[PDB]
Design a protein around this ligand. Structure first.
Ligand SMILES: CCOc1cc([C@H]2Oc3c(OCC)cc(CCCO)cc3[C@@H]2CO)ccc1OC
Ligand SMILES: CCOc1cc([C@H]2Oc3c(OCC)cc(CCCO)cc3[C@@H]2CO)ccc1OC
Ligand SMILES: [Mg+2]
Ligand SMILES: [Mg+2]
Ligand SMILES: [Zn+2]
Ligand SMILES: [Zn+2]
Lengths: 324, 324
């Protein structure tokens, strides 16, 4: 069944990859096989002299540190965000906007961006006086931990995929990866969208309409918003995929709300399985978060995010129709 | 000896307290005895229902987690910053401005602000790929660690000095303490000073003559700069104290530079004992960092800090006079 696995992976460059099928066919190794394929498609293994066995050893270790008993924030989500970022990096409006190291940073960041996620929110970890919130002083608690684990795993035997990067390349990549993953904290969404909007208004492009980003500050802001868009890309995918992602996030939400109920705390929004409307929540999610973000992105890359935006608007219409 | 210690602690409200003598007379417990004295002087045990045995147990545990084998960033420095903050809080321009909870936060933040300091800089920890820098993603590495340790120690046996605060009080105190200690990161000094200058330029004074601070942002900004001033107060102290602080920081700098040299790293500024001018470095420190800060603070509380600024200026003249 490697030939159908191979056949599914030939669409690695397409929005709507069959990531769940790939997860099943690969023996629950979608992060490993999708990351491997993307590194080959972009020729990053010999651009950065990465030994293929070191790539696989690290990826398997990284994938192992995603929890198999969390419904959403697991290795399938990691693989999906990697692949969505990979596609957004190939947006024609961004042709060669980013160096090979900036490409490598966005892809690596996507792969590690949720590693060792416990399936509960930053606010839960804060309000419960968790060890993670104590270590990180209530500030981007999960995202700081995802980075620390992602980088620490490079120190395991035969796991340093960056061993042949120069010392300046490693320092630059580390900084970019940190900046990107910290930006995936949902509490920073509005600041990040405000900066994406400012870049839209002050946007400068060539005659073909390709974006011109001269400052590193602007380029990292685009990469931050890019991985944020990929993190929030479920409602923009084909509906058969999107509905599975909704099932999984609601499982996590409800199991957290149970804990907020058993411990006796205030139940987080959308986490009370006894007073939840899954469909109304998705429509509001799209209306207030996902669509404002993806329509600003589509403008920055105008008109290249039309097919993705079209799917999102189709899916919003469908979810609304499921509300009597 | 306890007789003499008690007499010296009568100076706790004065700039220029004999803090090294108190460290000796107290059996190397300056942080414990000065904190206890200040808490009694401000009636904080009664106000917050702190059991005296719990306070002493926490303070001795906190003091233990300062490194007795670092020349500068030890329990004497912590005691000095605590006492300096205590004097700055009593300045006439701030009378009745801060609540008891804000006072408690500022003093507690001062006490924990360098706990478990290893005697090397954030940049050294980043450049040597330390476990601390890996934990904290190269971002305010030491200061995040000082906070995590200072809070973690409250959980040890009979150490929760905040056990009788309301949950809302504990939540507010925790956020203020985090905001204050993170502002002691020297990489934030220029932005902190820029905002303090903006506040002085726009400052408002009540009919009572005290500073008007009517929002969290302005209130925490003043406490942040207060503790940062106390942290950078050595050159404003009587010369016999200042020179001891200079001897101690230069020992730490030179030891860090010896480690950098042996590792083949670029030696940090002022850390090369074969190429250092102690006196020129102090004059530059005053001219570019300490006097800009203290002159702005003195403007905020005018004329309360005039004697402190006069001492700083005299000490700058003294060090300058040793150069030719
Ligand atoms: C209806 C929302 O559906 C989704 C939400 C998300 C993420 O977005 C939020 C979020 O956004 C709030 C503005 C808030 C919390 C906190 C826990 C609940 O209070 C958690 C998350 C998720 C983190 O990855 C992903 C997919 C979703 O659907 C497929
Ligand atoms: C001549 C400087 O004297 C002093 C400096 C300081 C602190 O201020 C800096 C700092 O600020 C810029 C100078 C930079 C580094 C990094 C290591 C050296 O590159 C370290 C420190 C110290 C941390 O507590 C305290 C007292 C001092 O004298 C009594
Ligand atoms: Mg995340
Ligand atoms: Mg410090
Ligand atoms: Zn995610
Ligand atoms: Zn300090």
């Amino acid at each position: 069944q490697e030939d159908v696995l191979a056949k599914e992976l030939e669409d690695v460059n397409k929005w709507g990859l069959h990531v769940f099928r790939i997860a099943e066919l690969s023996g629950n190794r979608p992060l490993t096989v999708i990351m491997h394929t993307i590194f080959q498609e972009r020729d990053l293994l010999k651009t950065f002299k990465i030994p293929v066995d070191t790539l696989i050893t690290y990826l398997m270790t990284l994938e192992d540190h995603y929890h198999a008993d969390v419904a959403y924030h697991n290795n399938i989500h990691a693989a999906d965000v990697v692949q969505s970022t990979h596609v957004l990096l190939s947006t024609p409006a961004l042709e060669a906007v980013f160096t090979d190291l900036e490409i490598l940073a966005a892809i690596f960041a996507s792969a590690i961006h949720d590693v060792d996620h416990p399936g509960v929110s930053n606010q839960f970890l804060i309000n419960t006086n968790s060890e993670l919130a104590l270590m990180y002083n209530d500030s981007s608690v999960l995202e700081n931990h995802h980075l620390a684990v992602g980088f620490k795993l490079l120190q395991e035997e035969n796991c340093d995929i960056f061993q042949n990067l120069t010392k300046k390349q490693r320092q630059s990549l580390r900084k970019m990866v940190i900046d990107i993953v910290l930006a995936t904290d949902m509490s920073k969404h509005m600041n990040l969208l405000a900066d994406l909007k400012t870049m839209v208004e002050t946007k400068k492009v060539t005659s073909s309409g390709v974006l011109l980003l001269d400052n590193y500050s602007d380029r990292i802001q685009v990469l931050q918003n890019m991985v944020h868009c990929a993190d929030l890309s479920n409602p923009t995918k084909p509906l058969q995929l999107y509905r599975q992602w909704t099932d999984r996030i609601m499982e996590e939400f409800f199991r957290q709300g149970d804990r907020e109920r058993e411990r006796g705390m205030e139940i987080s929004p959308m986490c009370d399985k006894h007073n939840a409307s899954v469909e109304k929540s998705q429509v509001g999610f799209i209306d207030y978060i996902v669509h404002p973000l993806w329509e600003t992105w589509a403008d920055l890359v105008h008109p290249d995010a039309q097919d993705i935006l079209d799917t999102l608007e189709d899916n919003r219409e469908w979810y609304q129709s499921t509300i009597p």
